[PDB]
Amino acid sequence: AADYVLYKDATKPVEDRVADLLGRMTLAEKIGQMTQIERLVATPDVLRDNFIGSLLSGGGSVPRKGATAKEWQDMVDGFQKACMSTRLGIPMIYGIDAVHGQNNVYGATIFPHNVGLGATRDPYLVKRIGEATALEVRATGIQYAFAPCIAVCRDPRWGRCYESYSEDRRIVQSMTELIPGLQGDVPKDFTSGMPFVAGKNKVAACAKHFVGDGGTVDGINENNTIINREGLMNIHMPAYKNAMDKGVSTVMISYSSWNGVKMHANQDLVTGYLKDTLKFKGFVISDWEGIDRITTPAGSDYSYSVKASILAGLDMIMVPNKYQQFISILTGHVNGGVIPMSRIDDAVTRILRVKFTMGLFENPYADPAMAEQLGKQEHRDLAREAARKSLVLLKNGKTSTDAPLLPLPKKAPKILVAGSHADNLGYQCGGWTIEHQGDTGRTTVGTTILEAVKAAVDPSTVVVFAENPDAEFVKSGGFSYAIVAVGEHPYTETKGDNLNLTIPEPGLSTVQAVCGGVRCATVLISGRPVVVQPLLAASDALVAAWLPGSEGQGVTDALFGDFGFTGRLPRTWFKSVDQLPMNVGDAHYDPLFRLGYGLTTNAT
Ligand SMILES: *[C]O[C@@]1(*)[C](S[C]2O[C]([C][O])[C]([O])[C]([O])[C]2[O])[C]([O])[C]([O])[C]([C][O])O1*
Ligand SMILES: *[C@@H]1O[C@H](CO)[C@@H](O)[C@H](O)[C@H]1NC(C)=O
Ligand SMILES: *[C@@H]1O[C@H](CO)[C@@H](O)[C@H](O)[C@H]1NC(C)=O
């Protein structure tokens, strides 16, 4: 008709649609696009009245505990219906931390955390995990995952070291294959730095957190990274360029500083480097209250937080709560000439560019036929393959002349499974699982190590579980062997920062009691290397299983010799925390186990 609106026409080029919509928008509509809010503060009126551009779920932000995929779809669609009811009908994009599967969601497949994936040296595996993750995210109606974390963790004292594929940038680079898994492969023609998402069965990705988040002093989370530009560019930056080449749709800025300059206020790096040198054309998003934390104390000059961040080049702000204040302050700054319209128009161009590119104007609503992708057995099979491939065998015999303990026989009259982490699904998933910090016990659908043992063994094999047996119990039990699992409790972000890296008790005391009685395979669950000499000294065999996720049969696949051990350390294992930071090229490089170490077995 003469009711045609070019931006609404799916046959037009993305840039023509962006320009056409931009040209129609009020300042309020523009600033609304730049605002991302928590679902916890969203209502239909809020979304409509403030022209909100995006919503998220922070860790543990769920419609309710145990919600079905359809409950999530219906929640997301309710918010979208409100956004579509605005004058311009701009759909919101909904983001979430799907960082090892769609991990906030009950019944979602939970993949190994990134450090384990590093150990696989299998970028195609990681791609396929991207692919599966996209499907389980879209099962829930969600279009945007805040992944991959391409931090290069340089000090394992950092509470997010498990979110880093490796201390070696080349491994992190190789695992940027998660991006085309989540988003789809970019076409032959593609210009590096353009955003890309294939369509409604894929999700927008997010390379995070730009830049040097894994380089902070003593691994303190959100702190300062002191390194010259050459080291920044040589360690922390390279994977951002691989992300551009694969069309990552968004980049999230780090809470960390670089030589004292807050990333969230760093115009030279965000605009000068990311946008102007790497030619990034997607949208730059803040971290959660990232702009607030520009100042000390945080939140003490919000006016300045908004100015500094938007002038630095950020496009979308993860507020995520005080949207009225954010919108009011940015409006005032624009009205006062402090922030030019050209900056607003750039941020909104980028946001709209991602939304049009990914098909969000053509498919703003969830597909109910996708709900059944959640926790699909094919995806669990993949997680089980990844878990097994992630495992790094550190010891398999106390002496060079002992019979190797692994692989264990599936037939034996009686076996012991022991330890705090042998039958605890939450602990084997770690942080960013159901809750932000993760949790203990049977928090979702999966298979614990105990469950996996019982599923694996010959029917004549009696399996005895004892969480923390004493030495006499073990000696008296008539056991052929034991599998004993211990390690770190779940943690996320600052809560995981840890200067001593010794596992909690009872962990070591149980290993000692078990292994003193019967030959034992110790399965160490951790997000990083931890003090391990005492555990090694006690154990016949020891496996670094990292945080292998929901599919504990990946552990038993290698214990019982269905597959051989192939994992190799993607990080240095230190002798002592007083050595840290210590990386695979220093000077005082005196590792317990060097990067790349890993014993192997053959399938039986
Ligand atoms: C769940 O947010 C936490 C933040 S951290 C922040 O969260 C965003 C969104 O979940 C992630 O994508 C990002 O990788 C991460 O750095 C803490 O710093 C907050 O203090 C906490 C308070 O509720 O929430
Ligand atoms: C680093 O942490 C110290 C100690 O908590 C804190 O006082 C300082 O502000 C932090 N620095 C940065 C840049 O975040
Ligand atoms: C495993 O296979 C390799 C190569 O074929 C061989 O050299 C090694 O001795 C094998 N180990 C065992 C226990 O069979």
Numbering used by the authors: -1 to 602
According to the publication:
Of the tested mutants, W434H was the only mutant that exhibited broad substrate specificity similar to WT, contrary to W286F and W286Y, and W434F, W434Y, W286F/W434F, and W286F/W434A that lacked activities of at least with one carbohydrate substrate. The G2SG-OMe thio-analogue bound weakly to native and WT recombinant HvExoI with the respective Ki of 2 ×10−3 M and 4 ×10−3 M, reflecting its ability to attach at the +1 and +2 subsites instead of the −1 and +1 subsites, which was most likely due to the rigidity of this thio-ligand. On the other hand, in W286F the electron density map of G2SG-OMe was defined at the −1 and +1 subsites, where this thio-ligand formed H-bonds with Asp95, Lys206, His207, Arg158, Tyr253, Asp285, Arg291, and Glu491, and stacking interactions with W286F and Trp434, whereas G2SG-OMe did not bind to W286A and W286Y. The dispositions of G2SG-OMe at the −1 and +1 subsites in the W434A, W434F, W434H, and W434Y mutants revealed similar structural features of the ligand binding to those seen in W286F. As expected, the (1,3)- and (1,4)-linked thio-inhibitors were less potent with tested mutants, while the most effective thio-inhibitor was G6SG-OMe, except that it did not bind to W434A, and compared to WT, it showed 8- and 6-fold higher Ki constant values with W434H and W434F, respectively. These data pointed out that the replacements of Trp434 with Ala, His, or Phe residues in the +1 subsite, disturbed the optimal binding of thio-analogues, due to the removal or weakening stacking interactions crucial for the correct positioning of inhibitors in the active site. While Glc remained highly restrained in the −1 subsite in WT and W434H, it was mobile in W434A, hinting that the overall flexibility of the catalytic site was little affected in W434H, but strongly affected in W434A. GPathFinder simulations with W434H (Glc at the −1 subsite and laminaripentaose in the +1 and +2 subsites and bulk solvent), revealed that the Glc egress path was identical to that of WT (path 1).
